[PDB]
Amino acid sequence: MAFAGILNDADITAALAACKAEGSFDHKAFFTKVGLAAKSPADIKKVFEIIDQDKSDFVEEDELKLFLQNFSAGARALSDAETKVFLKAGDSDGDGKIGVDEFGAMIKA
Ligand SMILES: [Ca+2]
Ligand SMILES: [Ca+2]
Numbered sequence: 001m002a003f004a005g006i007l008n009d010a011d012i013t014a015a016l017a018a019c020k021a022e023g024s025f026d027h028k029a030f031f032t033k034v035g036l037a038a039k040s041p042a043d044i045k046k047v048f049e050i051i052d053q054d055k056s057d058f059v060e061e062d063e064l065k066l067f068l069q070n071f072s073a074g075a076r077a078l079s080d081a082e083t084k085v086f087l088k089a090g091d092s093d094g095d096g097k098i099g100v101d102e103f104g105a106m107i108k109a
Contacts, residue, residue, distance in 0.1 A: 011034045016068065016076040025082045031107045048103065058097065
């Protein structure tokens with residue numbers, strides 16, 4: 001909408017419209033679709049502040065809920081299985097959060 005061309009609002013919206021059905025949680029496709037897998041450290045660090053929608057130096061599940069609204073104004077809030085598989089894409093230590101190093105890993109795959 002009113003964001004930088006670093007991200008394609010349409011691609012964000014696209015995968016988010018798809019990852020709204022339980023069982024259709026291809027969020028890794030989200031990263032590669034929106035172009036997030038082609039981000040530089042600096043970009044990924046502002047994206048850090050996105051999963052940290054609270055800006056608390058830590059990114060918890062409750063943040064991943066509205067973190068998408070912080071990513072894009074017309075984004076969908078992730079559901080049970082959606083947030084789960086999405087988080088675990090990077091969350092390897094299983095602490096219900098996105099460690100930003102876990103994050104870089106999940107985006108890169
Ligand atoms: Ca936070
Ligand atoms: Ca973790």
